[PDB]
Every structure is written in C-alpha cells, then in structure tokens.
Amino acid sequence: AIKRIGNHITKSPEDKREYRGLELANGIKVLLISDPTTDKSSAALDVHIGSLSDPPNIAGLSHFLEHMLFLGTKKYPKENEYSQFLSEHAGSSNAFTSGEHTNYYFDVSHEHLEGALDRFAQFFLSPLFDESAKDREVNAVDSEHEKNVMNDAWRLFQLEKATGNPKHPFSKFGTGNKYTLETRPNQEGIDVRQELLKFHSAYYSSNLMAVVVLGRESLDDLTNLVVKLFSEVENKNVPLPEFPEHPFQEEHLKQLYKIVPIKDIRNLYVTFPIPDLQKYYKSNPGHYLGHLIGHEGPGSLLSELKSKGWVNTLVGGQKEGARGFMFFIINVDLTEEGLLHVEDIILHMFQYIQKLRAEGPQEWVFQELKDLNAVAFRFKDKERPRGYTSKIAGILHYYPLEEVLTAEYLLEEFRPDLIEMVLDKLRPENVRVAIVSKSFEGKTDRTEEWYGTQYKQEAIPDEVIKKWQNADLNGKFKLPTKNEFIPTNFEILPLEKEATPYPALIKDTAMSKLWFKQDDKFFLPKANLNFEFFSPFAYVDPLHSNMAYLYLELLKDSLNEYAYAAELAGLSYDLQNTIYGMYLSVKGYNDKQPILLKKIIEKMATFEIDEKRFEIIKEAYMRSLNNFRAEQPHQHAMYYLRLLMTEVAWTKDELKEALDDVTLPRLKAFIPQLLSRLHIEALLHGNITKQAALGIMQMVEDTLIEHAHTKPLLPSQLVRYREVQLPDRGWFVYQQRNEVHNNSGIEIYYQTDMQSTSENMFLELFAQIISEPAFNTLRTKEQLGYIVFSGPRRANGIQGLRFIIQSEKPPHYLESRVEAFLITMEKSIEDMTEEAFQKHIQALAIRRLDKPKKLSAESAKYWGEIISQQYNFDRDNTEVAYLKTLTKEDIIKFYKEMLAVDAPRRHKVSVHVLVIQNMTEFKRGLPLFPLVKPH
Amino acid sequence: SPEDKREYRGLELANGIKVLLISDPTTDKSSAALDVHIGSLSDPPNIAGLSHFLEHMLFLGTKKYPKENEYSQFLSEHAGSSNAFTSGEHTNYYFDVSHEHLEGALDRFAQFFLSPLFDESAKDREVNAVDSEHEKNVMNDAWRLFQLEKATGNPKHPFSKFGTGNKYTLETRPNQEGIDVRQELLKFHSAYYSSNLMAVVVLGRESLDDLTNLVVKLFSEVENKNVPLPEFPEHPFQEEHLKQLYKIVPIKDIRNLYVTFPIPDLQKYYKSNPGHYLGHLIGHEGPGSLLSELKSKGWVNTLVGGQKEGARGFMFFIINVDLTEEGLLHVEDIILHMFQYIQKLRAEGPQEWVFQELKDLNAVAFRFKDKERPRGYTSKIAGILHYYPLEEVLTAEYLLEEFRPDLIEMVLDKLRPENVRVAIVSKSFEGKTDRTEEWYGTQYKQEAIPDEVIKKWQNADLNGKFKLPTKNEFIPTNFEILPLEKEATPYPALIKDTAMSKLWFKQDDKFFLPKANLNFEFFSPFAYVDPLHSNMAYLYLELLKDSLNEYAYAAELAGLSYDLQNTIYGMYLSVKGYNDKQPILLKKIIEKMATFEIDEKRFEIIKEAYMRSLNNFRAEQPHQHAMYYLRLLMTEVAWTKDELKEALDDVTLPRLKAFIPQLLSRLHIEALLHGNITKQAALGIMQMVEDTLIEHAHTKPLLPSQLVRYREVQLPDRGWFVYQQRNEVHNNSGIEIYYQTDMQSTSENMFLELFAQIISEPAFNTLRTKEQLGYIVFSGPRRANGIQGLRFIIQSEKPPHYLESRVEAFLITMEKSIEDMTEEAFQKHIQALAIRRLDKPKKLSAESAKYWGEIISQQYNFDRDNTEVAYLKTLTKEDIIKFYKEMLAVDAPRRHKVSVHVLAREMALPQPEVIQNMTEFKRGLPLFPLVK
C-alpha cells in the first residue's frame, strides 16, 4: 500500500514546523509532521470505533477491546524491558474510548519512535488474545467502571443515553461492568474472545483509522518508516453509517426531570435536537447563535436575569452526539429565587429568541467574529507536543488533511437559512427540561439502574408549554453594538536605535515617574502597561480602609459589563484593592490599548455609585469577615503575625464593628477627597516609540487633573510602613483559641536584618538547604500535620523565615519539634559534604536564572522591583555571581550568630492559635526599621 | 484682708510726716519707703525737672562716709534693691534690707536728713545721667505723646513744666545766669523735702515696737517749716484747645484715637469713685455693647477706657481706641458711636444694682487677696498714706462702700461735645504735621474738624442699638472650703478609668483656696495628617475663640479663665477659677466648639492673618531659624512654612465646615481635677462633659491602634551630621548643635542636666564674658519626643566652622575643667541644682501645671522629682566624666551628633555630612521607641 498525495499547505505565518499529509493505497489517513527544533517526538493512531457498537450482545466489549490492544497481550507485560524502555524515555501514554472514536496518545523523549512504531504495528498486524492476558484486563476494566460510577460528569452523560430511545442502541451502557463482561456471556454461551477475534479482523481493518507522527525526523524519513509498517494492514471495505435518524421519537419530548447528584450543585438543561449541517461548516451558524445567547453586553439575555438574580451565569453551546443526530443545550445557574421562578426563566429565554427572529440574521456581527477568528488563528498560542496528536487524529476522519488546521479557525461563507433553521429548532415543542438540585431528593422515586442518580422522569401534567408559545412577545433585549476596539495593526514597531537592556526613566516629573522599555527576545505587537496610583487617606482610618474597598469593589463591578467587549478583544483590565495604592493592569494589542486605558481612567476619576449596588456589596464584605472566624488556623496564624509586623494595622473584628455606621453619603464624599491628591507610577512595556509612550503618559495625567483635580503629593506624603524592631535577646509568645478546626496552629518567625543583595542570598540559600530535610522527616516521617511550611518571607523591605504548622499536637510540643529540627539542621549542614553544598547552591542558581517564557512574565519582574522601590532590574544577575562566591563556612556562621537558640542576635517571635496581653502596647514599645534606600 | 498680715499700725508725727508700721513675721525680707508731696509741677518755673534730679541726689547726701556709693555698697551687702522716682506732685523713695538689719538701714537714710551733701562732683555726673535718662525716654513712642499732652494745655500753667529734666535746663542755663545748682539743691531740700509732707512706711519682722521707737525719734530730726501742699484750682486748658482735632505722628506703627475731657476732682471726694464705674460700662463687652458694634463694623478690634490722672482741683477722662484701615476712614463715625453709647447710658440712668454687684465682687475679692510682693508694697502705701489712712484707702479704693447716684449722674453730665478735646494718632500722618515738641521731637498738627461737623456732633444725640449688660455671677457659691474627703491621696490617682475618659483627682489642702483648676485634652488623629489639615485646624480654633469671646468676658470679670490651644494631637481646653460658675462655664464652652457656625468675613480675616504669619517667618532671628529646623527632625513628620502657605490657599469655608464634625466624631479626653472640688462632684462634672459631647457630636472612643504619638529619628553611633540653610534677612549667622544621648530615664535625666548645670556657670564667663563672639549665647538641655539632647545656639557675624571649632574647644576645656574642679566644688554645684529642682509652687495653678505636663507626656509618676533629687545627690565627679566620654566626647563611639547651620546672608568642618533631601534622610534613619 504505497501512495502519497502531494500538496503545499499554508500554516500560521508565525509557526515554523513543516508538515505533509498523504493517503496510502489501503486508505489509512496519514499525516506527517516534522519539528526538528522540539526535542520531544510523538505519534498517534485513532480508530473511529466508539464504546457504542452495532452488536448489542454485551456492554463494554468494544471498550474491553481497546484495553486489550494496550495490554500488550502476555508478551509485552512479560518483557519488563518494554516498560523500562517507556520509563527510560519518560514516555507516558493515555488510552481512552469515546462514542465517536477510541483515541490514544503517546510520546518519546528523542528519536525513540522506531521501537514504539514496531510495538504499535504488532497489535494491528497480529493480536495474540492469550488466556493469561485476558485475566489481567478483565480486572482492569472492572476498576475503570468503579471510578466512572462516582463521576458526576459521566452520570449526566449516561442519563443522556437513558433519555435516548430505548429501542435505539444509543441507550446501551458504553462503560460496561465485570458482570456484563464475563458473568453474563458464560450463562448466555457467548464467547468474549471469539467476538474480539471477529471485531479486530474487520472493524479495525476498515478505513476508520488515522495515523499522525510529530517526529523531529525529516518528512522523507517519516514517510519511509510509517509507510512500510502500515502497508501490511488492508481494507475489508466495510461501510459504517453510524445512526441514520435521531433516536428520540418525540415520546420523551416536553418532559421535566429532577436529578440529585452525589455532589451539591444546581444546573438547568433544556434539550432541543438539531440537524447535522456538517457540510456548511464555513458559517458555523449554531455556535454563532450560542455566542449571542452567551453575550454579556447591552440588552443581553443574562443581563435581564442578573437584575432578577434568578440566573447568576448563562452559557449556550452546540452539543454533538452521533454524526446523524446533534442537539442544542442551554445551561442556566439556579438560585433560590430562580427555582421559584423556573417557568418565568424559560419564558425569558424564548423572549430573547423572539428578538433574534425580529432582527433576523445579521452579516456585520458574523464578519466581526470572522475578523476576531483570523487574528486568533494568525497568533497561534499554547502549542502542545502531547495531546495535539489526539485532537488532529479525530479531526482527520471528518476533515481533509490540508484543511484540518484552518477548519475551526476560519469562516468563509454566510448561511442565513441555516441560522433560520437552528432558530426554528429552538421552539417549546422540542424543549425538554432537566433540573439538578439537592433539595429534589425525597421527591424522586425513580433511580437510574447503571449509576445511583435519581430522576423522576415524571410527565408534567397540565403542561405549560402551550402558554409559552401563546404568550410569545418581542423582547426588550437589544442586539449588541459593534466592538469599539478591534486590532488592525499586526506590524511590530521597529526597535529604537538607542538600546536599553532594562527599563529607563525617559520622563521624570513631580506629578508622575515614567519607566519605559522596548520588546526584546519577543516579536509580538502585544504590549502591557501597569500604572500605580498612591493616596494617603486610604489607610488613614479603619473606616477609610473599609470605604476604599467598597468603592474599588463597586468600581470594577460597574465597569465589568462595559469591559466584556475588551475581554473578547483580548485586552485585560484588572482593578484590585491594595492598602498603599490602586493597581490598574492593562494588557493586549498595543494599537487598541490606549482607548480602553483612557475610558478606565475617566471612570476611575469620576464614579457614580447606586444605593442598591452599594447595599449588596456591603453585605458581601460583612459576610467575608464573618467567614474568617471559622477560617483555617494556619491562614489565621499567618494573618495574626502579619498584623503585628506592620506599624499600624486594623483588627478584622474592629473592621466589622465599624461597618455599622458606614453610609452611601460618606462614601460618595470620600471619592473626590481621595482622588484630589495622589501620585502616579508608570511601568510601560512592549514595542512602541519612546516619544509616543511619553505622550500616552501625558494624556493619562492630563485627564486625571481635568476630572479628579489630582495634584502632586508633597514630599514625606509617600512613606512606607516600618516593621517593629525585635528584642534580639528574647522569645515572646501569646495565645488565642480557634473554634472550628481540631488541629492546633503555632507560627514561629525569625526577623533577618534588612533587605540587601547578600542578605537576600543568605536567607534564600538557608531556606533551600533546610527544605529537602524538612520534607524528608518533619513533613513525612513525623507527619505531625499535613501543613508544614519552611519558606522565606519578604515584606516592608525586610526578610524573615516563617514556620506555619497546623497539627493535632500542643503548640509548645510543635515548637519543640521545630527547635529539634533547627539543631538537626546545624549538625546536618556540617555533616553535608562541600560538593553536596555546591550542588545545593547550583540548583538554587538554576532556579534563580530562569529566562522569561512570556512577554508578560518579563514585564512582571520589573514591576516587582519598582513597587518595592528597589528599582534593581538586574539584581538577580548580580546576585547569582555572588551565590557561587558564597561558601559553606559563612552559612554556618550566619545561623550560629543569628538564628541559633544561643545566638547573641536572636530574633525569635511566637504566635499561637489553639504573654502579649495588648498587641498595641507591645508594638508601641518596639522601635521602627527605616525604609531601604532606593537604588 | 485676712490673707494679708498686720499692716494696721500707723503714727502721724507733729511735723506732719506720715508713718505706717508693718510687722510681718512670715515675710523674710525687711523694707522701708519715703515719700514727699513735691513734684515737677511744683519745680521752679525756670528750672526743668529739678525734683527728679534731686531724688537721685538724696542717696549720696550722707556725710557718714566720703563715698557717694557708700549707701549703695551697704545695700549690696544686705542684697536689698533701692529705686526712687518723682511723680507729678510727689517724690517717692523705696528700699529693702536684711530681716534683722532694718534698724541699720533706717539709720543710714536718717544720715541724709542730718547732712545732705549734694556734692559738686556728684552734681556734675548727675546732670549728664538725668539728661541720658531723658534721651532714652525720647525713643519711647508712648513717652513722646505724654510729654506733648502736658505742654499743650498752657505754656503759663505749671502743667507744661518738664518732669524728667535735661542737663542744659538743669545746669547750663542756671550756671550762665550765675545761679549755683548745688546751692539750689540745698535750699530746695530744706524748703520742700525737709519742710513738710514726708511719708515714710517701714516693714519689719522682729517686732512692731522695735521699728516704732527708732522711727519717731529719728524722723523728728528735721524741723518742719509747715510748708503747704501745691494745689491747682482749675484744669490747665482755657477751652482754647476744646473742640480742636489733632493729628500726631507716632515713632511706632500704632493707630489710636484720644479725646480728653476736663472733669472735677471726684477722686478727691472718694465717695463713689464714679468715673471708673462709668468706664467699666463702656469697657464691658455684651449684647448691645460699644465694642460689639465696633467689631461688627470691623473698624475697631478693641478699646480701653479708664479715668486719667488728675491734680488736686481737676481730673481728666480719656479713651484709647485701636484703629483699622476701614476705621481710619470712618474715624468720625466711631466718635459718633461713642456719643451714642453715652446717650444710651443717659436713658438707662445711674443704677444701684450695677454698682452693688461691682461692690460685692470687690468686697469678697478684697477679703481674698492671695499675695503681696514685700518689695514695692511700702512705696505704693507711702503714696496713698498722705491722702488716706491705710484702712480707709484700702476699703474705699477696693469696694467703694459709700454710694452716690448723683456723682455718677454728674460725671455722665461732664462728658459732653463741648468738653471733648480731640487728637488722632496714625502712621499715615507723615508729612502732614508741622508743629514739633522741643523736648521729645514729637510731630503733631492742628486740623480743626469743620465747625459744621462739630455742629453735626451736637445736633446728633440719639442712642443707636445698645443693650444694658445682663447681671452675671460675680460671687463664689461657697466662700467656705468643702471638707477634705476621709480617704485622701497626696498625689492625684486614676479615680475613674473609662474607654473615652481618664480621670486624675487631688483636692488642694494646704492652700485652703476656694479656687480650683480643671484641665481637659481632646485627641484627634486627623489634625496632623496633612499640611492642609494642620492649617484648617488653626483657622477653626481662631474662629471659635473670636465667636465665644463675648460670653467669656463675663467669666474674666468674675476672675474665671478659659484657654483654647491647637495642639497637633488635638484641641486643648483648660478652666481655672472659682467653682461658682466653673461647671456652667465648662458646659457652654463645649457647646460652642462641638456645634459651631462660621462667619465668612471672620474666616477670611483669620485666614489672611495666618497667611501673614507664614510669610513673617522669612524675616526671623537666625538663631530662631536653627531651632525650627532642628524641631522638624525631632518631631519626624512635620510641614515647612512654604508647603503650609500653598495649603492655606487651598482651604475653603465649605471644606472647613465639613471637617469639623469629622474631627469631633471620635475623641479621647484626659482630665486633671485640682483645687477645692469634692471627688463625687468632680465625677459628676466628668460625666457632664462627656454627655454634652455625645449629644452634640456623638463622640466615640478611639481604638488603641488609632491612638498613637510621634517618634524621633535615631542618629548612628560615632556619627556627625550637618546641613546648611541661608537666612536672607539677617546679616549674622546662627548655629545650633544638638547632641542626643538616650531615651529619657531617671538616671539619664540627672546625668545630662548635671553636665548642663556644671558647664552653665563656666560657659557665661568663658564664652559670652571673655570670647564675646555674639550677644546670643545658650547652654541648656532640650526635651522632645521623650529624648534628652544638649543644644548650643550662638548667633554672630563670624565663620560657622570657626564658631563650631570654638564650641568643640570649649567642650575639651570643660573636660579639663571637670578634672580641675575639686570634689567639694562639684558637691556645691549639685546642691544648687537640687534646690532648683526642689522648688515648691507658691500658687495653685503652678503645681497643677506641673502635674499636667507629666500627663500629656504619658508619664504618670507625679512625684518623679523626689526620687530624681536623691539620685542627683549620689552623683560623683567620675560618673559625669563617664557620661561625657560615652556621648559628649568628640571621638565617643556611641556619640550621636546633629548640627543645624543657618548661614549669614553675605556668608572648614573636619567631617562633612551635608543633608541634600530631608525626606531621604528621614527614610534612611530609624525611629526611637515610644516611652512605656
């Protein structure tokens, strides 16, 4: 069977890997993909035979056969070298069956395909089906059934098979079970092995199999090896029509079911069947209709239901079963008010559909989606060496090899009649109601035989379907407007003649500080800009902190609807509450980035607050403070220690005492006062000319003065918090009691001077050195508690070591175990050889020296340095050279004089959650560490 | 007065000399005074200021020793001050002596009468000295106005005669005329001093009889000529100057309106003292008062009116009026307003109750005279001894027991448009004044107001909008003292502890005074948060004090007092005085501050005044600037005058109104109870103040985290810091060097203070007396943010590095001096320091203020001094050397040194550590722990 159709196929312009797809004479679909650059190589074979099978003699027989092909019969398990070969090359394979097809994906570390190809070739060429082999597989199939029984996702899927026509084979149980696999046939007289013989000979031989290779070897090398071992397999010319007609006969239409799952969750499913329409996939109309249903802009279906509160989340998507029959599914979130108004929610979905009928199909919205799809296709992302093979192999059976890459990423034709046809399908006549709730338990007397899921399948008497058809009226909903920003600039701006390896202060003003960088090591239009706004009033009072959070929470919630279109564009807006300042994150294509940024600045400068929105936000904030009372001790201990470190902090109980007097008028008065004085810090990044970037900073500051009347902060109005000074000679402990968790939590912390390049290295190295032994004994052999923490702490320009442990043991006993660990580590570091110490520092050095994998990640490192005010972008490169210089003797000295129990400079503090009688008095007594000088 | 001791014994000599005998055992210092009814008016007309020249001549008269200063050296031996002055009709002498040396001092004074030398050499030196005194008086703006007033009434009248005297008039014109001035002194002394009207008051303690026997025999040595007293029948003005406006140029920038009314000698009758009673009416501030009308117009900030001094036959009445730019434009209207108040007084008429209430307040207050200074008491008594016996003068002058409604009507009738003599003092009269007084060079001009305007004043006699003052409480509710509680604590304790309130209580026992003091501090975090926040707080305080001032005047008349201060931590309220209205006054003060209405015009004028203060600091002494720069660093967060000025422009009246409830929304109050108040009653007063606050502002207790104090930057050990600032206004340069040692502790406080005392006596002689580099010299310790430091502040036009090097050399010399000083000399130095620290307060207010300072510092050890003084006694010379070595020493390892350099306008260090940005340095240095 030697054949190779030849074509040159276009691929994402950015993508470099070259692939040739060919068809053999036997008719096996063949795809050859060559990627020499990637070290890993792979291959996949998909047979289009599902768990559902035309013979109904036993259930799970097809699933058993796919398992029988990965068992390796008796020869492959007998060879431990075969399994060792997979382990040596770090190759992990997953074998699974789906109703449409059975799929398997495997990987080899480098050029190990030849041996693997032969092993896979043997199963198809000749399966032994030995008696000893069958014994292991039947037990494995029974184990596979066990996990499926408790899987709620599978339980919904099997319920869909039950809702299938009983006469139709669609209602067969795909997973199968041990009793069906062996006990049921032996009394019947059917032989399982004889069936496996017949099925492999004809069904596997038929051309339902597709082979793809991701091997790094050249396409010509790929062609010779793949063709020789797949030429032997022949064609039995057996045609499979799947299911010609939909199983449903309208008998199970217009029925309401109540499902109680093991998990507590509430989802509503309305079932409507739909026609295949596979040939016209250019328009993809059903998904386009789903996008309109799932949209969250002006006059959205979810937006009305959000005001009612009946549906928190609405998602609409196409559902595909067999090629012959497909379905449309709408999922709505269920709320207690929504459960009472279930019928009204169903009518409201019809009202949006009525609006869609009135507007009709629209060419412009389809064109906008096509433009977005083209942009996404051109900039392909998250390419995967493993699992990509399985997806393409399934696509190959239904799609031509040349068109597989662009089939789902491009729209080429408009199909108005198809949009009308899917709209016609969405009518109450075809509607089926399925409701999931824990409360339904005890109202259901009917239980599924396969899995323990209870659905009444009761036939609604006095059906209200007629009322919904009779009362249909044009919806108040309005179709969404054209997206304001669509990326049109794909060209990357040329690098500036001046080259800077790190961010530079192109513009410095009292009003704002401006850091600028140009893209290097990456070639994408995508550019990201982070801006910090700092105002003193936010942290001045406990009332001020509470009011500031409410304003910021309200700000993002109001902007969320306006920024849904930005999410579709890929632009990213983030508004978050930080005690010192407000963090605005803008990410995405550079060309449309400024328009979104300015609109956010105007909304931030002048914000309107609704009383109803304020009340719900205030209630949610109050509930969160109540939750912390029942929160886990280890996090509670971490908060208690953090509260002591800051010069002044507000107790969580105090924060929820002083929310009693909070009012809307005080909050509205606060917004101009806070906005009136603030300072802007800038971290622009990506490919842009410096002059244009300076202009973008100028407009942002100009808008803020124009609306908020923001004026530059006076000197000394920008001071960081100072950590309390430790005694250096004493260990201090206070006790508090948890109410809900039986494990007692103790936290021990050691302050370590002030941040310095050498100081950072010493703390990091000590944490690295003790981490592996603590995991070896404290975490596992002692197993005092699941939560054991030995990691570095960096805050307020200071370094510390924190031990967060939650265990069912006395806190003092846990502290004694930590003390025993510290003395063991003293002896351990001395016992450890110098060569092992060098291996420790080298592992930390490799971890420190990580090259950026993403444009955003590269910008993030600079963002951290500036917010801390160190401004040391290259600090890691200077530090790694010092780490090699660092010696074992210095590390022993650092612990013996500072962190040791007998150390003269001993900084030890203790926080206990099951004496410091007043937190304020102890903090007032301690001096304050100065802010680190900026570099 | 029961509080006053004795003073009720007096004798009159046959010669007519007036003698009063005082014997106070409690008084530790003896005293004696002389007086005689002769004056500048009674000087020979040709001679000028003969009596003033003669009063100096009396001291050197003694022939006992041929030394002019022999009496003065005798007074120096007894350390008793001797001063003498001549009034218009009286010559007064006063001196004091050792307690057991009263007889010896009197004998020396007696020698002057037996032989008055008045030597020729003494006269030649005296003429120059008297002329020098006259020259110093010319610069005084007030004196130049007074001299012009005496001369203007009549050249012929003796009223015009010069009082001070000058060398040319005293000696040069008589000597050329062939008159011998020394012979004139001898003849004048026999004719007037020795002849009659002498008044001697003697204070002794050994016995009343011992002084009495000696004085009668010794003061009879002079033979009386029975010479009578000079009297003037009519006022000097002949009515030629009446209804005549004057414009006078003043040396100082002062604007005043003066009107003179000649009146009869009502004071000589002393029946009712009517003129002062009328003056109180005009002075009183109340609804419908003259000051309230003037303040509303804004023409006059304040006015003062008291009966002017008058001769035997006549008296004068004058008004002093502050003038504003708008007031200067409307001066005629202001005089018309004064006339309108007089017409309202005519409509009300004389009222017995107003006189009775004033008399009742005076009588109770006369019984309650807290203290009398022994020195100068004799001099005041000598003046009134001639006209009234002490018992009669004290009772009549203080409470006016006799009442005459007719006399009150007569003085009101005496004030009239015809009686008015007009004068205006303003700085806008330069170049408009031609006439110049010869003696003081004062420039004044006659600008008679058009006769038609004078007719307008006469034809306009209508009351405006004036309301008779409401009767107030001038009587303490209980004159007696409430009994001390059965359980009593010598030092105030925390009787009541509350989340919103802190209470300390002591009842004054030894003092036995009905008067009591209550101190309250209000805490607000927002006051120090921003330069704008500090600025608005001052404006609110200034608006509050102006608004409630009219009510407060009534308490001031009763002797009750209130204080409002803008401390950075929060508002300060203090109430001191009798308990009769003290609880009532406290509630009203709280009501005004917590709920307040702001007048826009008052806010604008207050805002301008605060802005004027900020620009004023640019022109300030260089040494004062150095203290201000050091203060910024010591207080950590603080704001410069520049940023405050921009913030002051930002403040607006609506913003200020919004901030007052926010400031008053949450407060913490700490209180001190002192004086005659029952503990249970005081607890009720504490409940009342908090209850008033919660109703008015819904006050809530501050959270412990919210309530915090400031911290101080910590200098590195072995570190020297300096920064340079330039003062454009002052030619000289001021340097302040601050050496920090440690957080204040009992041992630490004693050691540094001992060092400051040890070097204080040497510093004055070694630097100011010998080096004499600059007038400004300071060697004193400074306490801020619970940290002890020593500051040396010198202002001189000398190089700063040279001056700092001299300071370092002085310290090295002081270390050598400490070794040189004997152990006994060191013990004497500690003894002086111990006495200075152990000083008992002589007033109820002083001891309570000492307790108050500890409470604001957050240290509750009231009796800290007794423990500290015991430690000071244990101190050794070696211990001070160790303290100098650890921090004060130049090369000390733990030494912390900060230098503030204010450069001169037109104008090195071994180690230079210039501070470019203060904010960067504040971030760089750590913060000292707050004291526990």
UniProtKB/Swiss-Prot annotation, chain A:
Tissue specificity field: Detected in brain and in cerebrospinal fluid (at protein level).
Q: Where is this motif: SlyX motif?
A: 808-813
Q: For this UniProt entry, what's an example GO CC term?
A: external side of plasma membrane
N6-succinyllysine is carried by which residues? 147, 652
Q: How is the cofactor bound?
A: Binds 1 zinc ion per subunit.
Q: What's a single GO MF annotation on this record?
A: ATP hydrolysis activity
Subcellular location per UniProt equals:
Cytoplasm, Cytosol; Cell membrane; Secreted
GO biological process assignments = amyloid-beta clearance; amyloid-beta clearance by cellular catabolic process; amyloid-beta metabolic process; antigen processing and presentation of endogenous peptide antigen via MHC class I; bradykinin catabolic process; hormone catabolic process; insulin catabolic process; insulin metabolic process
Pfam families linked: Peptidase_M16, Peptidase_M16_C, Peptidase_M16_M, PqqF-like_C_4
- Main enzyme class: hydrolase
State the active site: 66
Membrane among the record's keywords?
Answer: yes
Q: Which cofactor does it need?
A: Zn(2+)
- Residue positions binding ATP: 384, 850-856
| Substitution effect: residue 66 to Q | Loss of catalytic activity
Q: What is its main location?
A: cytoplasm
Binding residue positions for Zn(2+): 63, 67, 144
What else does the entry mention about this protein? ATP-binding induces a conformation change.
Assembly notes: Homodimer. Can also form homotetramers. (Microbial infection) Interacts (via N-terminus) with varicella-zoster virus (VZV) envelope glycoprotein E (via N-terminus); the membrane-associated isoform may function as an entry receptor for this virus.
Q: What protein is this chain from?
A: Insulin-degrading enzyme
Where does this protein come from, organism-wise?
Homo sapiens (Human)
Give the classification, highest ranks.
Eukaryota, Metazoa, Chordata, Craniata, Vertebrata
